[PDB]
Subunit: 169 residues, 3 copies
């Protein structure tokens, strides 16, 4: 009888502590032995959320659809970042150059080309650490909503089309 | 007595295998039935980490604060990526155009406009796949730390302010 | 005997419901008490996946190696986003300016400088909300695969090197 009591009491501790470790509102019922399903929220890419009733479902959703504030809408192959300290974001993005970024579907990286002058000298940012790629040859992206950059010898700001327009008027 | 022995032995296997499945240093104590709490590390956006004692707490932290190397500091609405193979990063970012990126708080996407010439011809990157947006109309971002781009007919590198400065001196 | 029956039946419910909550194909065996290990897939940064046999291992892999479509290949310090609604991506990236982005290894942010004219006026995007940084002083990135931007007074598109080349020929 003492053994039966011990097992019952300890099994309740097992149920309770399992539910506690799961979180997501899981609870243990000593009358039935059931742990009620956890509810884990994940963030879809379309402005909605999903309720997951297992840990595995939540992990799969994190990979399939992203996390809050970081979403790629795709079923294409994973991005690949093999460069040292490199970042690859989006389906089929490949950052194989060191200290670089590939961002956007199909974006690739090739080595940075240092530019100090052109045939005009004294360029700022003449010694790049790597590239920041927004696409690939033949699959370029138009970079939009760029604020006017400083136009000075020291400036490493990007310039926008309105600035090139003004200088050619 | 054999039944009591069987239950005890099997319940220890249940406790052990639950702790193993949880990981995070969770352990089972057959004397009490308790699974000790796991410790799961998540990465905050301020250079610190958090210790989570449930799976649900860790999942919530991943969404609220990001993962190592990918942080958005916000409580505003999720980004939304509805374009095919599109990427949306940051609070209120919306990438609804296909093969595009919206990155930054409030960034939006509109269709790319192909540009082969302007009133000057022979532009490289005249057939964009989509846009890479760093903001929205009236909420543009200054793009900074841009290395000097190649200045040649083939170049799809961005140019910086020092380069526009040099050509107008 | 009824108590032994009750415990056995309830413990099976505990095992089953634990396996259900774990997901990842975990199953309970009433003959042994064992929950078979879950298998949780995470995405490495080199085009491969990993099979994790605990929740903690999966969480650690998500942080160490990223999620599908979002990978930074590094063991350097976390990115830091302390600016309001700011985004920091990549090892050692720091977005401390509000409404800004730092993306790329070692990228930093400093305050946007509004530019409406230069010594040329009527620039579009003269009131930036913040910065979009692809690097840091002395560690700039060459921005690549930029489609030709609109060249007009209204344009906030980035311009590429071929466009600057054409205007100086």
């Amino acid at each position: 009888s003492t053994s039966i009591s011990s097992i019952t009491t300890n099994t309740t501790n097992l149920g309770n502590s399992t539910a506690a470790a799961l979180g997501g509102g899981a609870t243990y019922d000593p009358a039935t032995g059931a742990i009620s399903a956890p509810s884990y929220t994940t963030y879809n890419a379309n402005g909605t959320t999903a309720t997951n009733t297992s840990v595995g479902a939540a992990i799969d959703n994190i990979n399939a659809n992203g996390i809050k504030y970081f979403h790629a809408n795709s079923t294409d192959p994973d991005s690949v970042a093999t460069g040292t300290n490199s970042v690859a974001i989006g389906p089929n993005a490949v950052a194989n150059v060191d200290y670089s970024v590939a961002i956007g579907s199909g974006a690739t990286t090739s080595a940075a080309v240092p530019v100090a002058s052109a045939s005009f000298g004294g360029f700022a940012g003449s010694a790049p650490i790597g590239v920041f790629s927004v696409g690939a040859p033949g699959a370029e992206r138009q970079i939009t909503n760029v604020a006017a950059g400083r136009i000075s010898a020291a400036s490493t700001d990007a310039v926008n089309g309105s600035q090139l327009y003004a200088t050619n008027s």
